[PDB]
Design an enzyme around this catalytic site. Structure first.
Site, PDB file in Angstrom:
ATOM      1  CG  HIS A 169      15.125  52.634  73.725  1.00 39.08           C
ATOM      2  ND1 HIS A 169      15.192  51.460  73.009  1.00 39.08           N
ATOM      3  CD2 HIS A 169      13.838  53.046  73.651  1.00 39.08           C
ATOM      4  CE1 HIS A 169      13.997  51.172  72.529  1.00 39.08           C
ATOM      5  NE2 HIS A 169      13.159  52.121  72.900  1.00 39.08           N
ATOM      6  CG  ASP A 223       9.669  52.319  70.977  1.00 40.10           C
ATOM      7  OD1 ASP A 223      10.634  51.935  71.673  1.00 40.10           O
ATOM      8  OD2 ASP A 223       8.752  51.549  70.625  1.00 40.10           O
TER       9      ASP A 223
HETATM   10  N1  LIG Z   1      18.108  50.299  72.989  1.00 38.41           N
HETATM   11  C1  LIG Z   1      18.497  49.491  71.982  1.00 38.41           C
HETATM   12  O1  LIG Z   1      19.250  48.564  72.221  1.00 38.41           O
HETATM   13  C2  LIG Z   1      18.055  49.743  70.597  1.00 38.41           C
HETATM   14  C3  LIG Z   1      17.947  50.990  70.067  1.00 38.41           C
HETATM   15  C4  LIG Z   1      17.508  50.864  68.728  1.00 38.41           C
HETATM   16  C5  LIG Z   1      17.220  51.793  67.712  1.00 38.41           C
HETATM   17  C6  LIG Z   1      16.796  51.352  66.484  1.00 38.41           C
HETATM   18  C7  LIG Z   1      16.660  49.987  66.216  1.00 38.41           C
HETATM   19  C8  LIG Z   1      16.940  49.054  67.200  1.00 38.41           C
HETATM   20  C9  LIG Z   1      17.370  49.479  68.469  1.00 38.41           C
HETATM   21  N2  LIG Z   1      17.718  48.805  69.622  1.00 38.41           N
HETATM   22  C10 LIG Z   1      17.662  47.404  69.741  1.00 38.41           C
HETATM   23  C11 LIG Z   1      18.418  46.545  68.930  1.00 38.41           C
HETATM   24  C12 LIG Z   1      18.308  45.165  69.074  1.00 38.41           C
HETATM   25  C13 LIG Z   1      17.436  44.630  70.018  1.00 38.41           C
HETATM   26  C14 LIG Z   1      16.667  45.480  70.812  1.00 38.41           C
HETATM   27  C15 LIG Z   1      15.717  44.924  71.840  1.00 38.41           C
HETATM   28  F1  LIG Z   1      14.713  45.850  72.156  1.00 38.41           F
HETATM   29  F2  LIG Z   1      15.115  43.750  71.378  1.00 38.41           F
HETATM   30  F3  LIG Z   1      16.464  44.647  72.981  1.00 38.41           F
HETATM   31  C16 LIG Z   1      16.777  46.856  70.669  1.00 38.41           C
END
Ligand SMILES: NC(=O)c1cc2ccccc2n1-c1cccc(C(F)(F)F)c1
Ligand SMILES: [Ca+2]
Ligand SMILES: [Cl-]
Ligand SMILES: [Cl-]
Length: 123
Positions: free
Chosen positions: A46, A91
């Site tokens: 991601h 996503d």
């Molecule tokens: N790939 C990730 O890191 C990530 C995966 C994920 C899944 C659910 C909910 C949140 C999730 N994140 C996340 C968590 C905190 C900040 C950020 C941002 F996109 F702002 F970097 C992303």
């Protein structure tokens, strides 16, 4: 954006999106190191997807996009532009990835000092 990230993950998977806010070396803002488990791999993937989105001229943390939750599956659209389609794809992908994983509680609030400086490469 983050609103849809949380929403899509909640739609498909079994657990609160709070479960991934600080988990392993990659679930959370930024990240580096060897991924600890399947969940952490999903987050690394991601992170790469969002990096690509930014390199394409998009704002993956902020841009709103429409989507539907149908039978605990994410359907992307309608898309007004390419950024909305790329973001929803990112996503949708992690949501599907995480929905297929077992949670390892021990990696929630994992110490950053155990995460290595370098990371695996992005596709
Ligand atoms: N790939 C990730 O890191 C990530 C995966 C994920 C899944 C659910 C909910 C949140 C999730 N994140 C996340 C968590 C905190 C900040 C950020 C941002 F996109 F702002 F970097 C992303
Ligand atoms: Ca991250
Ligand atoms: Cl839960
Ligand atoms: Cl960042």
């Amino acid at each position: 954006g983050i609103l849809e990230l949380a929403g899509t993950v909640g739609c498909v998977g079994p657990r609160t999106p709070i479960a991934y806010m600080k988990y392993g070396c990659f679930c959370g803002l930024g990240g580096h190191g060897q991924p600890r488990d399947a969940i952490d791999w999903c987050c690394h993937g991601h992170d790469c997807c969002y990096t690509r989105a930014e390199e394409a001229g998009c704002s993956p943390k902020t841009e709103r996009y429409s989507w539907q939750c149908v039978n605990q599956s994410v359907l992307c659209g309608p898309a007004e532009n390419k950024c909305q389609e790329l973001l929803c794809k990112c996503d949708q992908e992690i949501a599907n990835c995480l929905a297929q994983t077992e949670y390892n509680l021990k990696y929630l609030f994992y110490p950053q000092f155990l995460c290595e400086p370098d990371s695996p490469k992005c596709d």
